[PDB]
Amino acid sequence: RKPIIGVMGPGKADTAENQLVMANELGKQIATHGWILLTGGRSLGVMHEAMKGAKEAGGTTIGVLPGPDTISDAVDIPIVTGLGSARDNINALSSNVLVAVGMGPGTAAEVALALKAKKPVVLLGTQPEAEKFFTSLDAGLVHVAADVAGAIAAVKQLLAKL
Amino acid sequence: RKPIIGVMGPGKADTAENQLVMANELGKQIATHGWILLTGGRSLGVMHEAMKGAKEAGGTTIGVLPGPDTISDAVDIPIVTGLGSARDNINALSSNVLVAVGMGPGTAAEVALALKAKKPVVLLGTQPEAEKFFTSLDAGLVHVAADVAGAIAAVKQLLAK
Amino acid sequence: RKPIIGVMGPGKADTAENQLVMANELGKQIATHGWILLTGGRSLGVMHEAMKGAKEAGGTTIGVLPGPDTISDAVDIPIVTGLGSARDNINALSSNVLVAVGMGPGTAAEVALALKAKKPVVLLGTQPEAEKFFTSLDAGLVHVAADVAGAIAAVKQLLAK
Amino acid sequence: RKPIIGVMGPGKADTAENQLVMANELGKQIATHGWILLTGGRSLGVMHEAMKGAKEAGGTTIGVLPGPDTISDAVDIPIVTGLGSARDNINALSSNVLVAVGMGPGTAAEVALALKAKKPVVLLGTQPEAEKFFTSLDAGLVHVAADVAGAIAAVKQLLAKL
Numbered sequence A, D: 001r002k003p004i005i006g007v008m009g010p011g012k013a014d015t016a017e018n019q020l021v022m023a024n025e026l027g028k029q030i031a032t033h034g035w036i037l038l039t040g041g042r043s044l045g046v047m048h049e050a051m052k053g054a055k056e057a058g059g060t061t062i063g064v065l066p067g068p069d070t071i072s073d074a075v076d077i078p079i080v081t082g083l084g085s086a087r088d089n090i091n092a093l094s095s096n097v098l099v100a101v102g103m104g105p106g107t108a109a110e111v112a113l114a115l116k117a118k119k120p121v122v123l124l125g126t127q128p129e130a131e132k133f134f135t136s137l138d139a140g141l142v143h144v145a146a147d148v149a150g151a152i153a154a155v156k157q158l159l160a161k162l
Numbered sequence B, C: 001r002k003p004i005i006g007v008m009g010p011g012k013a014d015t016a017e018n019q020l021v022m023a024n025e026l027g028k029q030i031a032t033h034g035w036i037l038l039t040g041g042r043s044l045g046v047m048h049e050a051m052k053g054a055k056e057a058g059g060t061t062i063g064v065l066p067g068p069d070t071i072s073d074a075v076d077i078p079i080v081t082g083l084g085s086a087r088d089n090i091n092a093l094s095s096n097v098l099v100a101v102g103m104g105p106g107t108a109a110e111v112a113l114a115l116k117a118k119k120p121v122v123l124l125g126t127q128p129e130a131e132k133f134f135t136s137l138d139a140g141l142v143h144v145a146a147d148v149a150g151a152i153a154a155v156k157q158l159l160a161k
Helices: A017-032 A046-058 A105-116 A128-137 A148-161 B017-032 B045-058 B105-116 B126-135 B149-161 C017-032 C046-056 C105-116 C129-135 C148-160 D017-032 D048-056 D105-116 D128-136 D150-159
Strands: A004-008 A036-040 A062-066 A077-081 A095-102 A121-124 A142-147 B004-008 B038-041 B061-065 B077-080 B097-099 B121-124 B142-145 C004-006 C035-040 C062-064 C075-079 C097-101 C122-125 C144-146 D004-008 D038-041 D061-065 D077-080 D097-101 D121-124 D142-145
Touching: A004 A017, A004 A046, A004 D097, A017 A036, A017 A046, A017 A095, A017 C035, A017 D142, A036 A046, A046 A062, A046 A105, A095 C075, A105 A121, A105 A128, A105 B105, A105 C097, A121 A148, A121 B097, A128 A142, A128 B105, A128 B126, A128 C035, A142 A148, A148 B142, A148 C148, B004 B017, B004 B045, B017 B038, B017 B045, B017 B097, B017 B149, B038 B045, B045 B061, B097 B105, B097 B149, B097 D004, B097 D061, B105 B121, B105 B126, B121 B126, B121 B149, B126 B142, B126 D077, B142 B149, C004 C046, C004 C105, C017 C035, C017 C046, C017 C097, C017 C148, C046 C062, C075 D142, C097 C105, C097 C148, C105 C129, C105 D128, C122 C148, C129 C144, C129 D105, C129 D128, C144 C148, D004 D017, D004 D048, D004 D105, D017 D038, D017 D128, D017 D150, D038 D048, D048 D061, D048 D121, D097 D142, D097 D150, D105 D121, D105 D128, D121 D128, D121 D150
Parallel strands: A004 A036, A004 A095, A036 A062, A062 A077, A095 A121, A121 A142, B004 B038, B004 B097, B038 B061, B061 B077, B097 B121, B121 B142, C004 C035, C004 C097, C035 C062, C062 C075, C097 C122, C122 C144, D004 D038, D004 D097, D038 D061, D061 D077, D097 D121, D121 D142
Antiparallel strands: none
């Protein structure tokens, strides 16, 4: 069974370009390590980039969508859930590790839900407020990474322990 | 329609004793103001206290629960969802305002989801990091409350808007 | 607690005129028997008629809806779920009995899901194939009703058990 | 994008052996055609068999589960949904075609939901009552198949038209 790595980030308009770069590179390295990328299939911000990156590097991608899937070609496997744009809905109970790249309400909710699920989360491109808050929720499950390499190292290690 | 006030908070193990007392007092004040209380229908920290409070004050309560069968007399309208408890689903898109008493991963998810749905949230007895962080996600929708009465005043303001 | 009676049925386009009249009459009788009506809160065939009926008879209604914002005055307790409308989610695990008036794919799914959850379902104005088929899934939980009063009698029997 | 074929059937105790055979063979032929099998990952009746079949024949499998995934090794990609054993919950909005093998409450619900989603469904090993009822819901979307070959022909054709 290939490890499944989750990526979550804000959608287009509330995303710094450094985060799209970080997302795509992470994408790359997720695929490069032989891991499946699981992310939203909605083809906009951080997630689309991760998917482009994973797919470019030969990786298998999974794109979660809610409804009538009109979905980047970076997606290999669309999981259409039927639920809302409330999330974010919530299959990163499927990932071995979750990586957040940036932050916003949707991402915060999925990070919390993964902590609640006792899954480890790597926080990349988030701000002090987020890092501290999430580390306060579960210091044992939250890993702050300075950059993509750091994020990928955190993941590799968490996988080695499993 | 009576306003529906959503209450979120941690469970038995993770609710502090001061947070129980506040959740109970908040429940009471929700009822005394003529509002319906919506909260988790199985969960025994904050949510049970809130509901027990609303009820003692003669309030009407809606309890959201993931399924059968593990319900409290304190719950009037039991809504069984047949999703899981991966999410505290209570459902505060049903609510006019959401009040988080205390904090933890489940609560943090529901506060973040309300905000994502552009709903105001009142934060009571959440620590400084919760308050600063949620404020960082959406400063116009997050209201920090010092104590039950402040939380009630925030709720009233949001309702009168 | 008042019994909660779940009503399922097709939407505006697919509800026959006789089925509107029955759904309205069923709503009325749900209310007159002191039960709460639970049904879809956005859907304008059977479910709207049922709710309009309960309401005219002074009944209390719970409307389940997928989201904001597209609600009827006929709905007292609006429950917004923030799932989709891939499923009529109304939620009849919340209900004591489920009544399907008329039939179609959405209705068929909710009737099958109630049965899966070992809940009794009363089938009203569903055609012979619906009745025979659901009966084939679980004969002890499926009750065919000839008309509103028979459906009400079935419901009463299930409640008295 | 590989076509995703959905399979649904009753779980263990309410399943004739002819249906487990039919399920496994269908599984086989789904994989043999280069299609992804999407089914419940719960490792018991019709679905487990389909998965064993798909995996034996080199196919990629997707196993939907609700909760804390304690999940046959026939699953490649577990999608953990977080929802109930209410379903059945309900990602066969992801399949191009759905195949029911046998029938029971859970299966009936997913067939209906797929008809509601305007997706085509092939009914294999079901009884007259089911065939007629579902054909009455949407005659244009429901295909009754006498056997696995027939089921697989129905699918191939529906895919050709898409």
